[PDB]
Design a protein around this ligand. Structure first.
Ligand SMILES: CCCCCCCCCCCCCCCCCC(=O)OC[C@H](COP(=O)([O-])OCC(O)COP(=O)([O-])OC[C@@H](COC(=O)CCCCCCCCCCCCCCCCC)OC(=O)CCCCCCCCCCCCCCCCC)OC(=O)CCCCCCCCCCCCCCCCC
Ligand SMILES: CCCCCCCCCCCCCCCCCC(=O)OC[C@H](COP(=O)([O-])OCC[N+](C)(C)C)OC(=O)CCCCCCCCCCCCCCCCC
Ligand SMILES: CCCCCCCCCCCCCCCCCC(=O)OC[C@H](COP(=O)(O)OCCN)OC(=O)CCCCCCCCCCCCCCCCC
Ligand SMILES: Nc1nc2c(ncn2[C@@H]2O[C@H](COP(=O)(O)OP(=O)(O)OP(=O)(O)O)[C@@H](O)[C@H]2O)c(=O)[nH]1
Lengths: 49, 99, 63, 98, 459, 57, 320, 120, 52, 64, 347, 55, 26
């Protein structure tokens, strides 16, 4: 195959990429849960519902 | 000749190898397709149906309503011995003049 | 759509921008006098806190 | 504000003036730099001693701790400029004009 | 207006990841579709501007310019196909991105609600054209062309910014609806003159005005053809759209300080038209022609009469279609002859039949035959100016006569006469540039049938 | 008949139409944001008939 | 992990493996002097790796599979114009030397990476401190004007000061009348066209500037052809040398950190090979450079950074 | 205009007092634009790194957008909090100081003497 | 302080020498202890604008 | 190309601030604008002076 | 310089600046400046070129003089007030002494002939660290003491900076020199709004930090130091210089690029304070900054320049260094205008 | 004479030259440290007393 | 072919100061 020497990014770093999706879902469900609890924190602070 | 540069290539004419082309690009099949689609979209419904759209637009600035309402109070002024239109748009009684 | 589209839309838009216009002018003067007088919730520049002072009896009596 | 304050304040001015008029010597320039430090240390000592600011008597000390620290930096810089250019007149280091 | 904004920005991903040969076909077809969608904006009420959203509004002044931009965008797309063939695909998509970005900023500019938002996208058009003029130009001078065009507009733009933010602190809002509705008389205090001034030279530097126009001959004659049309057809008119807007509050100052610009303009077009008659480069004439035609617009706005405003709008749209045609026409000749000297390629009617027509009414619309919208805008200016002052008539009447003098002159010095026998590369006229002229001219006569749509909100 | 190329060639061609309907979706996501005075302007103060419950949408 | 500052912080040193076995050496012989035979003979018995003389297309071996690229896209010049007609306005002669210069930069650079990452010494065929010998011989024979020559040392000094001379070198001595016979004996038609004075100019520069200034940076092992064919004595003396004189011992780990850092990334290694000095043999036209830069792109692999070119494989690109 | 207001606990991103405000909606155009900033950052990353731009490593791309929306979210919550504080000291100070903001009566258009400048 | 970490982290780093009436060693009062004590107690939380 | 280049480019490099050039610059510069400034100002002042007391012919003019 | 010592040397610089932005005692603020100077001088002469020695030297005398003047101005304030807290200065001479004492650290007024060639002599790496990080500390002090500032002096400090910075950049070829004058130009912009609204100069600081960062590590990737050396990058790296256009346009404030956000937002604030003549002035004289930006833009990739045949194997090799946040920095340095109201987060 | 000789000389070229002319004197600094700090001293001195920015 | 910068166009700003004068002549 073309590059005889192992290219610096020849294969995915399953540690590196696996972290990347691993953290990204964390980034989401934190925001999702935070958005909810902020809404529940809303409706009783002002007594909306 | 310090600056090693290729000589100015002569400009190519679209009709040398493609005499029946339309002067849009090199590959022929899309050259007709380009011509078919611009000649379609341009002078067709963008032009024709566009012209019908603007010409047959709904009331533009309401001048038909102007004439209809104008004729109504034209009769009203002429009916009860009134001038067709007074000199004050706003009634001079409600305006409280100073002094 | 009918003119009630644009008529009532303008009513909403013109009113909302009207409140913003008056509030902007009110903010300019409110900040102006609050900065000058200083008797306001903001623009309170910090000063020395009074809890640092020691009140215990010192060496000399008269201080 | 008695005359001793005038003497050391006016002194610091000549330290400022002396530094800002490099004639022909980096070493003599650094002298005026450490010169400033005397008046600042001496005035500071007079202030917190007169006012009995006992807890602030450390301030002249901490001035001196950071005083010689700069002094070491100046001579260390003076080491190479004199080493690789021969002397210490501040005129031969204009290669950075362009 | 996001029904136009959203598809317009959606042109970017589509044009940036299309095939290496479909970029021209795809961009042309859907831009035309945007034009058809933009045609629905012609609807206007009696006097209420269409208030779609808080940050977007349009009336009978914005929409005709809006359609002009959207209708124009495929025209440089087809015009650029000629001289952009010898380029890599990535750079070609970059060119399309600049044109689409230029269009997107234009629609937001016309549909803007307050002046500051209008100002941001107004000026923002400088960036896409700056790349277009400089990167893809043809000659050494284009580097000096970009700086001349950039600084000139910017030099007047910055004072307007200071005045605009000053409006917000004083009146309380910069929204056009509130400004006109909360309009108050402007005093003649010495500060207010500069207050009036700072809101003016920004619009008139890019008109361009006599004296402050040198960027116009130094850019339009020198920009790539695709950038040349959008510069002349719309970009100059950005001052027009602003000036009808900013004049709603700057009163009654206009009575006094219009004079130093009025006869600056009034002697202007006559002077400029004289230069057009005595050019040596082709594109230099139309560029000098554009400022000459733009000059009567300056008088139309400044005189502040309803008739002039209608004449200003009609001449604005008519000149855009015209100036685009002649610039396209010059590009067609320049491509085959690889120069723009006027008398270099005189006498080409015998070899270019359809072109000789495309010269014919394009110049005639420049002569403004009746009842072309050019006169409808031009004549309305005359009646408004005459009502202002009777002695006006001689000047611009003499101008449109010297306008007539040159407007046949290139027709004589490009088509009338005998071919140059050494020239042998004038090939068969390709349908691309040929159909380009058709799409330029037919809307002109079509709008001649029903001009009532392009007199602006004062109609 | 070459299912891959037909979609691959013309998958970019729907981008403008979806933007249009998306564009037409959100600009009229704006009216319900600017409800305010509905049938409240006395010029168009129209008494609501029993059949409908809204002036415009 | 590639050797960066992180490895040195971790404690990764190369002085620990820098020993008597880490001899980077190269046989700086004359043209067709048997230096390649002598160099490879050292390689097998001393345990050192062999670096073939970095030619115009050695850089093509450093990047990708190693097939020699096209002349226009791998140097714009070639060797037949040098030997056949070494006089023309296009200046293929110096374009060779300028390009051939950077090849030995890499050949020595990869030589470093071998013995700073493993500590195992290498063998080459000439090196960076041999390219001036050809260029000096180039000027005396009337090939390319001195403006290129005086630019050569300016480029040479700013791409080799950071570079440390080798451990030892070998100079094979073959008499110049015999070499002219040797090149005539091989039969390469380009070798016939070579002027006889060129070969002695190579011999002169070998024993006028290279050998004198090399003596204080590596040991002199000048061996005649009668001393070259025997493959033993040329390597027993290498072992029986001292490796004392030179800058090698006084290069601590911080120098080696600076060394390997610069040579790990080639971009600054030959950043000064493209000096903004415009020359007839080096200044490609704006249009010519543009298309040629494009021309480099359609070649396989040379579109994205290595490991990302889907055209030559590199699967799982959407995750890489 | 706010660093000196009383009760301002330092180095405290979102006050507990601020939770009484409406949290930014997930569809908020300000928020979704910050997502586009993450998307754009991903494309820039592959351009410098010489990677297949749009179709390159999605994990690097998807991290950028996911990060930007998050730090975008709290920045938007802090956005309205300070603006609400600006609107809180707004009216409390207006009520506390009534005399310097007097109420204006009505003096309707029928009575103003405002003139008409003849535009001729 | 620009970024008041001392107030947040709840420790003292230099809020012991900044004034003359603080806890001096062995309760050695300064010269103007009473004068500054009244001044600080005067303008505490009133703001710099009102203090001047 | 010599004519175009000399008629377009080589006028400023050959241009001189010669007092004659400034003289023709002045009379063809601010001159005509001041000419038409005075003419239109005089016309406007003479025209305006009769509008404010009704001495013009305007009865059949309600368009502007 | 060994890697471990370099890190601790940097940490001392960040700690020195951090000490400035958290301490409430004047002596500690002076200490933070002293530690910042002390840990930075070795950083400048990291490579030990002949130029760096006097480049580091010119740094030392300038900032030591600034530090000593700052100490003196502190002392008078203690003498007349008996206070060490950073609230205000109760002696006008004490304040009127610190403005220049802090100015030379910032390099605004004719206390600026150190900035250009100190940037020139030292490497590009420390050049970035010099023009971005070294300005948080002196500006942080100015923000705290913003109350008792002589407006006449402070405004003149900035007005002089904008004029000289713009004027000087027109006659520079070495990219580092033009960056220094351009940085000096932005110095006046941030400091002009200082007396009125301190929130605004923080916003301009943050934008300027991204501009200078993104511009510099683009220069690092291009590995260029003069205009001619940058020109050839179009042959090798077209995207880097094409990106450099937008940053150059943004650095000049040409909107709707992010660089307008300071210039726009600042002008709005001062017009609230009836300052009109001066805001018009920097609006005018920001254009000379734009000039040598476009000349840089013209010379980089707006017009492809003559290349060098030694670039073939250059195209054969890719960068191994890994600038991070560069894809991020361009985004904030180009398109954040729609999020302009976020300045209230700083407030 | 009017357009191509005077207009571009009455605004663009004059202002461009003015920046051109005195950008040199700003940027033609020989680099002497003594001269730089001498300018500091004058700026320091005239900051107060003369310009009275402390008053 | 559109015009492109040439060698003599590169050298216009190729000096130490890209605006020269007598003072900067050396
Ligand atoms: C805004 C807020 C965000 C800011 C983001 C900053 C972005 C920085 C981008 C760097 C990307 C990498 C690249 O191509 O780098 C070039 C460049 C290094 O150039 P190089 O030639 O690649 O270096 C080779 C090594 O020296 C070879 O190593 P060596 O053998 O020479 O040993 C020294 C080496 C040792 O490194 C390590 O040990 C690691 O030093 C370094 O690597 C430098 C960093 C050291 C650690 C710093 C930790 C800070 C926390 O990076 C720097 O010079 C970094 C300077 C220091 C950090 C940034 C300071 C500026 C920002 C201040 C304002 C902050 C916001 C205020 C509000
Ligand atoms: C996007 C385009 C627009 C960008 C605008 C700027 C965005 C980037 C900066 C926002 C994050 C940094 C500031 C906020 C933060 O992290 O802490 C705030 C702050 C940090 O404390 P702080 O506000 O004391 O720290 C900075 C001090 N001043 C304000 C003087 C500059 O958190 C707080 O709790 C503040 C309390 C007081 C609030 C009034
Ligand atoms: C507005 C932004 C553009 C402003 C004008 C820029 C200069 C004119 C455009 C041409 C620049 C020269 C060039 O080579 O452009 C193409 C270059 C990438 O070239 P190449 O490597 O062939 O692309 C492979 C893609 N798979 O790619 C580029 O140049 C990309 C340009 C990106 C510009 C920044 C965009 C930021 C986000 C908005
Ligand atoms: N210009 C130039 N030519 C080089 C360089 N290195 C090698 N060459 C050429 O490489 C070619 C082969 O070198 P030779 O020594 O003749 O190779 P050889 O025949 O294997 O040599 P022996 O092993 O001694 O037999 C010659 O044309 C050299 O001039 C270099 O740095 N510059």
């Amino acid at each position: 195959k073309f590059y005889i020497r192992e290219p610096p990014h020849g294969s995915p770093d399953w540690l590196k990429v696996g972290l990347t999706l691993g953290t990204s879902v964390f980034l989401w469900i934190y925001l999702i849960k935070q958005h909810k609890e902020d809404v529940l924190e809303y409706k009783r602070r002002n007594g909306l519902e | 000749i310090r600056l090693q540069e290729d000589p100015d290539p002569e400009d190519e004419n679209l009709y040398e190898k493609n005499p029946d082309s339309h002067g849009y690009d090199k590959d022929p099949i899309v050259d007709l397709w380009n011509m078919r689609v611009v000649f379609f979209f341009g002078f067709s419904i963008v032009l024709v149906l566009g012209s019908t759209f603007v010409a047959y637009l709904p009331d533009y600035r309401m001048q038909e309503w102007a004439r209809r309402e104008a004729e109504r109070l034209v009769k009203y002024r002429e009916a009860n011995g009134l001038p067709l239109m007074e000199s004050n748009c706003f009634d001079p009684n409600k305006i409280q003049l100073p002094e | 759509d009918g003119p009630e589209k644009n008529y009532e839309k303008t009513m909403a838009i013109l009113q909302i921008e009207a409140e913003k216009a008056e509030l902007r002018l009110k903010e300019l003067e409110v900040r102006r006098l609050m900065r000058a007088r200083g008797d306001g919730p903001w623009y309170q520049y910090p000063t020395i806190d009074k809890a640092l002072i020691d009140h215990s009896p010192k060496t000399t009596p008269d201080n | 504000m008695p005359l001793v304050y005038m003497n050391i304040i006016m002194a610091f001015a000549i330290a400022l003036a002396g530094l800002l008029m490099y004639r022909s010597h980096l070493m003599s320039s650094l002298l005026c730099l450490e010169g400033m430090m005397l008046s600042l240390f001496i005035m500071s000592t007079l202030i917190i001693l007169n006012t009995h600011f006992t807890l602030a008597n450390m301030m002249p000390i901490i001035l001196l701790v950071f005083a010689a620290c700069e002094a070491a930096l100046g001579l260390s810089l003076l080491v190479m400029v004199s080493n690789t250019y021969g002397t210490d007149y501040v005129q031969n280091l204009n290669l950075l004009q362009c | 207006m996001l029904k136009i904004i959203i598809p317009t920005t959606m042109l970017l991903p589509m044009t940036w990841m299309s095939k290496h040969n479909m970029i021209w076909i795809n961009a042309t077809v859907h831009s035309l579709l945007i034009s058809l969608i933009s045609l629905s904006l012609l609807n206007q009420l009696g006097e209420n501007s269409l208030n779609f959203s808080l940050t977007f509004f349009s009336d009978s002044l914005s929409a005709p310019l809006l359609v002009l931009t959207t209708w124009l965008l495929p025209l440089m797309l087809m015009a650029s196909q000629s001289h952009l063939s010898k380029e890599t695909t990535t750079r070609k998509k970059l060119y399309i991105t600049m044109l689409i970005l230029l269009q997107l900023f234009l629609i937001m500019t016309f549909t803007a609600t307050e002046l500051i938002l209008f100002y941001i996208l107004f000026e923002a058009t400088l960036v896409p054209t700056l790349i277009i003029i400089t990167r893809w130009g043809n000659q050494t001078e284009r580097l000096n062309a970009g700086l001349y065009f950039l600084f000139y507009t910017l030099a007047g733009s910055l004072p307007l910014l200071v005045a605009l933010v000053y409006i917000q602190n004083t009146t309380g809002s910069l929204n056009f609806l509130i400004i006109h509705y909360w309009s108050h008389p402007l005093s003649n205090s010495w500060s207010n003159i500069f207050m009036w001034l700072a809101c003016i030279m920004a619009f008139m530097v890019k008109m361009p005005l006599y004296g402050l126009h040198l960027w116009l001959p130094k850019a339009h004659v020198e920009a790539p053809i695709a950038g040349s049309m959008v510069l002349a057809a719309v970009l100059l008119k950005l001052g027009g759209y602003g000036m009808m807007r900013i004049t709603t509050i700057l009163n009654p100052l206009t009575n006094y300080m219009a004079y130093p610009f009025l006869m600056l303009s009034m002697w202007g077009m006559i002077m400029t038209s004289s230069i057009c008659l005595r050019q040596t480069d082709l594109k230099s004439l139309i560029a000098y022609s554009s400022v000459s035609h733009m000059a009567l617009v300056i008088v139309a706005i400044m005189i502040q009469t309803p008739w002039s405003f209608m004449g200003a709008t009609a001449l604005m749209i008519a000149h855009g279609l015209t100036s685009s045609m002649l610039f396209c026409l010059a590009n067609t000749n320049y491509e085959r002859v690889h120069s723009r000297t006027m008398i270099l390629a005189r006498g080409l009617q015998t070899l270019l039949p359809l072109m000789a027509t495309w010269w014919l009414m394009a110049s005639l619309t420049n002569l403004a035959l009746p009842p072309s919208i050019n006169l409808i805008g031009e004549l309305f200016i005359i009646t408004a100016s005459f009502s202002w002052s009777n002695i006006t008539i001689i000047l611009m009447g003499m101008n449109m006569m010297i306008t007539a003098l040159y407007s046949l002159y290139m027709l004589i010095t490009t088509q009338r006469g005998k071919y140059t026998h050494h020239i042998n590369n004038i090939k068969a006229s390709f349908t691309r540039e040929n159909a380009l002229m058709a799409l330029h001219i037919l809307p002109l006569l079509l709008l001649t049938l029903n001009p009532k749509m392009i007199l602006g909100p004062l109609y | 008949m070459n299912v891959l190329q037909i979609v691959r060639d013309h998958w970019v061609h729907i981008l403008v139409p979806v933007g249009f309907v998306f564009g037409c979706y959100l600009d009229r996501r704006s009216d319900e944001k600017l409800t305010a005075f509905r049938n409240k302007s006395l010029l168009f103060k129209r008494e609501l008939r029993p059949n409908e419950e809204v002036t415009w949408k | 992990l590639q050797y960066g500052p992180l490895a040195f912080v971790l404690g990764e040193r190369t002085t620990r493996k820098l020993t008597e076995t880490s001899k980077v050496i190269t046989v700086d012989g004359n043209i067709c002097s048997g230096k390649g035979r002598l160099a490879r003979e050292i390689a097998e018995k001393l345990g050192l790796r062999h670096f073939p003389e970095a030619g115009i297309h050695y850089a093509d071996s450093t990047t990708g599979d190693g097939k020699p690229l096209d002349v226009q896209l791998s140097g714009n010049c070639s060797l037949e114009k040098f030997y056949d007609d070494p006089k023309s306005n296009d200046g293929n002669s110096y374009r060779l030397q300028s390009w051939l210069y950077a090849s030995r930069l890499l050949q020595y650079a990869d030589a470093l990476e071998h013995l700073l990452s493993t500590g195992q010494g290498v063998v080459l065929e000439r090196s960076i401190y041999s390219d001036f010998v050809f260029l000096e011989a180039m000027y005396r024979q009337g090939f390319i004007r001195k403006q290129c020559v005086e630019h050569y040392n300016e480029v040479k000094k700013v791409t080799a000061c950071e570079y440390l001379p080798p451990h030892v070198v070998v100079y094979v001595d073959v008499p110049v009348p015999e070499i002219q016979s040797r090149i005539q004996k091989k039969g390469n038609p380009h070798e016939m066209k070579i002027t006889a004075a060129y070969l002695q100019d190579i011999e002169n520069a070998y024993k006028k500037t290279f050998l004198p200034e090399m003596s204080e940076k590596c040991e002199v092992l000048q061996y005649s052809a009668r001393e070259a064919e025997d493959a033993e004595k040329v390597v027993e003396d290498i072992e029986y040398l001292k490796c004392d004189k030179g800058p090698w011992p006084d290069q601590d780990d911080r120098t080696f950190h600076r060394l390997r850092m610069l040579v790990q990334n080639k971009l600054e290694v030959l950043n000064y090979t493209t000096i903004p000095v415009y020359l007839p043999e080096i200044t490609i036209g704006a249009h010519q450079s543009d298309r040629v830069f494009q021309k480099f792109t359609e070649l396989p692999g040379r579109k994205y950074s290595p490991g990302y070119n889907e055209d030559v494989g590199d699967k799982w690109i959407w995750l890489k | 205009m706010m660093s000196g207001r009383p009760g301002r606990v330092p180095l405290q991103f979102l006050p507990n007092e601020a939770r009484s405000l409406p949290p930014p909606k997930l569809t908020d155009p300000r928020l979704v634009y910050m997502g586009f900033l993450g998307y754009c950052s991903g494309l820039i990353d592959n351009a410098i790194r010489r990677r297949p731009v749009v179709s390159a490593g999605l994990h690097r791309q998807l991290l950028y957008v996911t990060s930007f929306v998050f730090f975008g979210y709290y920045l938007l919550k802090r956005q309205d909090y300070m603006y609400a504080l600006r609107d809180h000291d707004m009216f409390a100070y207006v009520k506390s100081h009534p005399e310097d903001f007097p109420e204006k009566d009505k003096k309707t258009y029928g009575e103003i003497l405002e003139e008409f400048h003849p535009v001729r | 302080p620009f970024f008041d970490v001392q107030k947040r982290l709840g420790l003292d780093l230099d809020r012991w020498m900044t004034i003359q009436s603080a806890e001096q060693p062995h309760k050695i009062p300064g010269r103007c202890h009473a004068f500054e004590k009244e001044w600080i107690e005067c303008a505490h939380g009133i703001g710099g604008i009102r203090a001047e | 190309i010599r004519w175009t280049y000399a008629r377009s480019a080589n006028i400023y490099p050959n241009f001189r601030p010669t007092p004659k050039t400034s003289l023709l610059g002045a009379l063809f510069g601010i001159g005509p604008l001041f000419f038409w400034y005075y003419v239109f100002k005089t016309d406007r002042d003479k025209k305006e002076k009769l509008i404010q007391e009704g001495k013009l012919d305007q009865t059949f003019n309600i368009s502007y | 310089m060994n890697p471990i010592i370099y890190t601790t040397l940097i940490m001392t610089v960040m700690s020195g600046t951090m000490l400035v932005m958290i301490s409430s005692h004047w002596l500690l603020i002076w200490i933070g400046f002293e530690m910042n100077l002390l840990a930075m001088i070795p950083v400048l002469m990291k490579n030990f070129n002949p130029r760096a020695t006097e480049a580091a030297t010119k740094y030392f005398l300038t900032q030591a003089t600034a530090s000593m003047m700052l100490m003196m101005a502190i002392i008078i304030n203690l003498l007349y007030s008996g206070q060490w807290t950073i609230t205000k200065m109760f002696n006008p001479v004490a304040m009127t002494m610190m403005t220049m004492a802090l100015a030379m650290k910032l390099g605004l007024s004719p206390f600026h002939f150190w900035v250009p060639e100190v940037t020139q002599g030292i490497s590009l790496q420390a050049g970035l660290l010099l023009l971005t990080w070294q300005k948080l500390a002196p500006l942080s002090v100015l923000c705290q003491i913003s109350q008792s500032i002589n407006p006449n002096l402070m405004l003149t400090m900035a007005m002089l900076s904008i004029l000289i910075g713009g004027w000087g950049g027109l006659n520079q070829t070495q990219l580092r020199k033009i960056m220094a004058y351009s940085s000096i130009a932005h110095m006046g912009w941030m400091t002009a709004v200082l007396p009125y609204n301190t929130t605004m100069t923080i916003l301009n600081l943050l934008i300027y930090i991204t501009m200078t960062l993104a511009m510099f590590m683009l220069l690092i990737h291009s590995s260029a130091t003069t205009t001619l050396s940058l020109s050839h990058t179009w042959n090798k790296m077209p995207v880097i210089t094409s990106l450099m256009m937008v940053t150059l346009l943004s650095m000049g404030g040409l909107p709707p690029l992010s660089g307008f956000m300071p210039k726009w937002m600042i002008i709005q604030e001062m017009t609230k304070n009836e300052s009109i003549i001066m805001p018009t002035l920097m609006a005018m004289t920001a254009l000379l900054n734009l000039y040598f930006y476009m000349r840089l833009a013209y010379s980089s990739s707006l017009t492809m320049f003559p290349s060098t045949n030694n670039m073939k194997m250059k195209w054969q090799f890719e960068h191994t260094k890994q600038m991070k946040l560069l894809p991020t920095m361009i985004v904030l340095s180009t398109l954040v205008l729609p999020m302009t109201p976020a300045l209230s987060s700083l407030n | 004479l009017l357009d191509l000789i005077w207009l571009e000389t009455i605004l663009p070229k004059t202002t461009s030259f003015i920046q051109m002319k005195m950008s040199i004197m700003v940027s033609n600094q020989k680099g002497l440290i003594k001269l730089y700090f001498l300018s500091f001293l004058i700026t320091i001195m005239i900051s107060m007393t003369l310009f009275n920015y402390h008053e | 072919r559109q015009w492109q910068p040439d060698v003599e166009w590169a050298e216009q700003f190729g000096g130490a100061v890209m605006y020269p004068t007598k003072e900067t002549a050396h």
